[PDB]
């Protein structure tokens with residue numbers, strides 16, 4: 001019954017809030033998707049170990065540099081999120097979020113998560129990105145970034161289709177359990 | 180929370196809270212607006228409840244069952260009485276605005292048309308000044324409250340006994356001492372997100388779109404002032420550490 005804390009970080013529209021909601025409810029909300037996430041305590045059993053995983057969000061704190069670090073105390077695993085339909089949100093991963101998470105959370109495993117992977121095949125996503133001389137984040141660009149920032153690993157998921165969501169959180173539990 | 184309010188805000192949305200034949204009578208844009216307003220009140224009800232767990236369950240229980248200085252309990256629960264009054268008054272104003280909007284013969288069917296006014300009173304003038312001062316005070320004592328809980332939980336067996344005892348119910352799963360403290364620090368940064376999504380579907384009446392635009396600017400001004408006012412306190416800090 002060990003207790004572990006998980007905090008998800010990332011830019012405004014990286015889908016961190018949708019991801020925590022979809023995992024804690026265990027389905028894509030059919031009628032209404034909530035604007036905000038309060039907190040949750042998930043009961044996870046990974047590789048034979050039972051863990052109470054407390055989930056937290058940093059949405060709303062991105063502009064407040066003194067309030068935001070109050071979410072970090074005693075974090076056991078960091079989910080560093082970016083959105084596959086926003087290659088610019090990936091550029092901020094090593095320049096803004098990594099040095100802050102390493103400063104406040106030394107030696108805490110970080111999993112780089114590419115969210116919204118369904119948008120890699122969406123036509124409106126490609127057409128709009130190509131207007132700004134861009135295209136969806138490629139699987140190798142995510143893996144290289146995780147490698148460069150010294151991440152524990154790289155994962156992709158789609159909160160809209162629920163694909164990869166369960167595996168991200170069970171892996172995060174494993175990462176939190178390593179001494 | 181009180182049973183009446185918990186049932187009124189038990190559904191996942193305004194669409195599911197109201198009767199289906201009442202929902203059918205409204206435009207999609209209104210349903211979308213109502214869903215975000217219902218989420219703002221539902222989360223405010225949960226916020227006030229979190230503060231009652233801190234004041235009535237944790238704070239008062241420690242005073243009545245343990246032998247700790249009143250200074251220890253004050254360091255574990257800074258500003259909780261002031262925060263509880265600020266938000267219980269806000270919640271009363273939001274719940275009354277909903278009640279006034281109820282159809283006669285119904286306790287569940289309503290539509291809130293005016294909201295920007297209530298949000299402007301909460302986040303402007305004297306009331307906003309006290310809330311801003313209260314949040315800079317709370318957030319500057321947040322780390323010290325956490326270290327003090329951990330110091331007492333690892334050195335005091337009777338404090339540990341008390342904690343295991345009052346946090347045993349399943350309803351308290353995500354509401355332990357440190358969780359309540361972060362839930363309260365995170366509350367203020369939620370308001371702009373909810374207000375921005377309410378404004379996104381309030382373009383039908385220009386007086387209302389303007390009221391919500393003013394309210395969005397007021398919460399962001401408040402937040403920036405609370406963020407500027409934070410200077411973290413340390414448990415047992417020396418004077419030399421502070422003036423450097």
Ligand SMILES: *CC(=O)Nc1cc(C)no1
Pocket residue numbers: 308311312315404405408
């Ligand atoms: C947040 C805040 O309003 N702080 C404050 C204002 C004045 C005047 N003194 O402290």
